[PDB]
Each structure stands twice: as C-alpha cells, then as structure tokens.
Amino acid sequence: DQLRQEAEQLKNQIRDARKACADATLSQITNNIDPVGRIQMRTRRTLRGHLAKIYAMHWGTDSRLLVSASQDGKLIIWDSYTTNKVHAIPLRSSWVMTCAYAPSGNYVACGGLDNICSIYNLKTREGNVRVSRELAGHTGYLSCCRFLDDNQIVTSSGDTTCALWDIETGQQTTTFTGHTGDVMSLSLAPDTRLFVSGACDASAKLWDVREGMCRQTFTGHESDINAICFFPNGNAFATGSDDATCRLFDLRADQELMTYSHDNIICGITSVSFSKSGRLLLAGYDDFNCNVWDALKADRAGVLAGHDNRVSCLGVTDDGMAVATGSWDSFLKIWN
Amino acid sequence: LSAEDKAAVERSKMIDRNLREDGEKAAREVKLLLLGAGESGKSTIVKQMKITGIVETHFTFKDLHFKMFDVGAQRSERKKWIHCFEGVTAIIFCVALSDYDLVNRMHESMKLFDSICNNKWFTDTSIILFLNKKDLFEEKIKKSPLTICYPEYAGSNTYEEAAAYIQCQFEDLNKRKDTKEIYTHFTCSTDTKNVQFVFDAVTDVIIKNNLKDCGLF
C-alpha cells in the first residue's frame, strides 16, 4: 500500500547526502593543471581479411596478439607486429556481438543472438581449435563477456541480467539482477573482485562478485548506455551513451565529476577506453571517427579519422603503446 | 630480413585463401528475414517449405540456396539488434486477413509494417507481403462487415474488393516508393506457389541490383 512512499522519501535522502559531499567541482580543482595540448596519431598497421562488419575485438596481455569477431562467421587472431593471421575460428552462429581473450592465452569466448557463450581452446594437441564449453541459460542476447581466470567468466545479457559461471560444469554460480532494461556493457576491475554494468535504462550498477549484491547505483544519463570502462585506479569509471555524451563517475563520492560533450557532436557512442595513466579518455562515435578527451579538463586533444563507417570497437593495450579501432567497414587499425 | 618467420607467412596465406572461398560461396545464397504479426502465419509459411534465439531455416529451390531467419523468439529492444540484418536480400512480412474482427490486430500489424518499411537500415530492402488466411476471411465477411475496422471504407463488402482495399492500405505505407518495391501475395494451400513467388521476387531483386551496379540503371 504505502510501500510506494517510503522509497521516494528514502531516495530523497540520497539525493541530499550526495549534495553535501559536493563542494569542489573538479573542473575547478584542475583549472591550473598544465594541459596536454594537442595529440597527433598515425595509422601504423591495417589488418585486412574480414568480409563484413566486425562487432568486437580484444587485446591479449602480451600486448601483441589480438582477436576480432565478425558477422561473416569468423573469429580471427592476429599478430599485430606483422599483420599475420595465427588462427581463424569458424563459428556456428554468424550473429556474434562480443569476444574475449583470456589473460593466460589458452582460451577465447564468443556470443551473440543465439544466447550462448562458446569457449574455444587454442593450446591443444592435434593442432586445431576446439570448443570446450557452450554455456547456456540466458534468454536475451549476449552483449559482453569477460574472463576472471581460466575457469570463471562474467556475462551480460539483454534479458536484464548478468551472470557468473563455472566453466568446468557449465552452471551459473551467481546471477545478478536489478536492472529494468537490456544490459549492454561490462567492465571488470583490476583486482577482478568487483565489476560494473551499464544498461539501457540509463543506469550503471556496481556489483560484488563475492556475494551478489549491488553496492551502488549511478544515474545521470538521458538515454541508453552502450559502453563503460574502469579507471586504472579502480576508484572511478566512465560511461558512454546515445545522447552523444560521456561521463565520469566516482565510487566513493557516489556522483559524477565530468561530462564530455560538444555542440557539434550529436551522434551516439559505441565504445570507451582510457590510457595507461588515466589522463586521456578515448571514445568511439557513430560519425565514423574516434575522439580523444583530456579526462581532467573535458577539453579535446585529438581525433582519429580513418574509417569509412561506424567505429564499433576500440581497445588499448596493457603496455600503453598502441590503440586498436574496429569499424563496420571490415577494418581494424592500429594507432600510436 | 626474415627467418622461419617465412613459414608463419606461408600460413597466413593459406588462411586468407579459405576466407575467399567462404565469401565467394556465402555470396551466392539469398538471406531473408521473416517477420509478422503476433503468431499470425510465421509458422505455416515454413512448413509450406519442406527443408533459443534466432532460428535459421536453410533450403533450396532451382539451384538457389535460401536462408530464412526467424527471430520471433527474441523478445528484446529491437532497436539494438535490427542492424545485424542491414544487407539482407529481402524481408518477408506475413499478416493475416482474419485479424480485423479479432482483438484491432490489423492496426498494430500496420504499425509494425510502417515501423519496418520506413527504417534507417531498410531504405533499399524489398518486402514480400503474405496476406494469409483468406479462406476464413471469406467467412468473417458475411457475419461481420469490414467497417468495424476501417470506418472510411465505403464499398462492396466482398472478397475481390475488401482484399484489394487491404492490399492498398498496406502498400500505401512506404514513403520511398522510388527505391524499394513491395510484392504481395494471397496464399494457396496446395499447388505450392508460395515459394515460386519468392523465387520470382528474389531474382527480380537480384537483377535490379546488378543493373544498378553496372551504372546503366
């Protein structure tokens, strides 16, 4: 009956307990800090061989090998220093929308409109590549997948859920609920102990892999969120949405600090990533080009225009020497 | 300049070679996307041919391989995955003719038709319309007239007229009548032409595309 009241009142407390913890307006704190200026990058490599749109990519921890997934029914592995193909995995479902590369390097994963996360083993005798598990139990469509170790993996689905599995059996060890919309983005933390999800109800949520409870909920957007990434300190993240706007959220303050926007930018955002230092945030847009932002002043610092169609995926490597962008034009591009 | 690394290139070339053969082959099939009103005819249309998310149906007719994608078991935000099909050869759209009396359904079917035909991704994609269940439409006329659905309908309450009125009220919903065509068909139980019609329409589409490629449209 009156249960729909205490919540509202209760919510009004939060809206006030995070307005007294706001005094600095970071854009003011970092007013004297020396700017970065302007950043020029150049296409060093171009990786050809895909016959359709590529919908995702992922780097390896060696900072040399990467994997890409396309809707031609192909998952290709590349040496980036030569442009040589190490493996080409043919899938059963051409409708793939995500990919991952295990930290060790023995496994990859894929998924999409079939509602199944398929794990593939690369380092096996017989000199082939075999599917080891087909994790099923979702009802939507796989929108992201991330490894914790070689026997654990987190998944997000368009059924308003996320899940933590156990690959040896193939059963959900935990199921994360609370969203009211298709979930579209994931980011794990450095410690691989608490992760963050970004949904189409214009919200983000911070989970806790150990228990299964949402510790904090973040709002502020005016449309669907499609991308999210963690700051390297593990104490902040960034979100990209269809309102042509990125935002930075802090966990402890439980607010947002900076918004990254521009009047002459009206397209949506498909991807987000940081730099090894956490000083320049990269973003992939639908206007066919990527942009670079100074994440302490909100100014721009550079543009990456080499693609003849949407930038769907964007990644940065753990050593910090390169960026890789993917496009619907069936091309990946390395920048330095 | 190199080493046994040479053998790592001779490999990357045996890979780049099979991707071609996979694309020089997946380009001679025809991909179709199947949509329809809520549980109207999207099922019987498949059984008319004799061969968990998306359902792929592969079949063949006169040395031409068709792949039909049925995605009704995918209840989600369609705005987020309906661009995976941009580049599909055609859209089959199945609507019924016994759905005006029932409940109102023809109106939402037309809403979906207008939401699909006039989409950013299907500005060039042709549509094959199947108006099905005409046998029963013959009976739901005598008892119930048509004006119960379309007030502005002022004409002979008969098959050869109401069917054409529905056809027109469906076909006058494409705003870009100059870039895509709409093919329409009333289904026959036996004498399986429901697939010869698809064959004709598809070959017409293919010719109309080859002629645009050759710059002498």
Partner: single-chain antibody
Amino acid sequence: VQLVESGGGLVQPGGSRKLSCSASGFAFSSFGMHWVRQAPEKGLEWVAYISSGSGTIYYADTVKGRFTISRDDPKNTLFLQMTSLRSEDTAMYYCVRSIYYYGSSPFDFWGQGTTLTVSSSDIVMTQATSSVPVTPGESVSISCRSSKSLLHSNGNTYLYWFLQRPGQSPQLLIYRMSNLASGVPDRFSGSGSGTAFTLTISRLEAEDVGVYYCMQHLEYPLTFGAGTKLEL
C-alpha cells in the same frame, strides 16, 4: 598422437626404395613435416622438409637429385622416394612434425623409425664434451657452441635441445634457449647468449640419462651437434 614409419629393409647399392609415414591423431594438413636420420653409432642428420600446402620444400646437399619427398594429405601419409643408394645411407629414419606460428613448439613429436641398410656456408654446432658420469641427486650442465650468432633482429634465439634415451626416440626438451616444452618437469632450464648456450639440470633423477643434442633453426640446412652422453 601417433606416427608410424615403414618401408625399410636390406637392399643393394644403386637400387631404390620408398618410405612411408602414416599419421593418426592430429591435423596432418596443418603441420609441416621433416625426415631425419641417425646412423648406427653416430648422431642425427637432417634430410628433407615439406611444408603445409606443399608449396615449399628443402633438401640437404647430400641427397639432392636422388631423393624426393611428398605428402598425401587426404590419406594422411608422408612419402620419401630414394634412388641411387650408397653405403652412406644406412640409418634409422625418423618422421617429424613441426608447426610454425607465433608461440609454437616445433619438433615436438617424433616417430619410432625405419631401419634401412644397404650392402657394402653451413653452420657448425659443436659439443666439446662427449661423455659425463654422474650420480642420481646432484646437478649437471651441458654446453653448446655455435660458429655464428643465432640471435636475430626480431629478438628470438633459435636453439633447440633434444633428449634421446636408450632404445627410444628423441624428445623435445627446450625450444629457443629459454622455453620449456609440454610434458617435461621444471628441472631442465635453458640459458645462454649468441655463440654459446647452456642447459642446466637440477635434482637429477633416473630416466634423465641418455644423449642430449643441440640444434639450430635459423637458416636451412639444419644442423645438430655430436651429442653429449650423460650416464651413471
């Protein structure tokens, strides 16, 4: 995984022969294939190599013109045709698999061999020592010397360490002077810098006694060492 060779027996000088290697348990088509020899009381010498796709072949300067290597992939078989046999060809022949991509372990599986006997600008890898007695429990080291730096511009150092036990076939221990194969304990370690390399064995144990061999994969032809024996 399996590799069975056949086609060897007593023949006469001037004759001809054909040896066959049947594979069972792996993707024969994705693997390049080698033939290797071992004379009765001597070391290992290389013979021929054919790639995946067969669009690349290499012979030694001792058999060119009178040998021919081929492969039938549909039937998973490797062939060596030999003409004009001399007494310098009595040996045990071994069929070897090798796959090349970033991070691969070539020369990983060998066969059991065919014993043939007929009636009566290259790198030089040197293994000074030829015999070493030891006791189970202590540590050991073995040294290899090359007449040319094996390090390359890409950063890789192409040296391979093999082990042959009494009455068995060789077995890859180490590839590229630092990497350890799949199926060998951590006792074995590799080290060194161009023109000199070292293998270290700690907390020794039985079954580690036999003949150790050095190999280079920098440029064809390929070359082995004389073989360092390690017994009790």
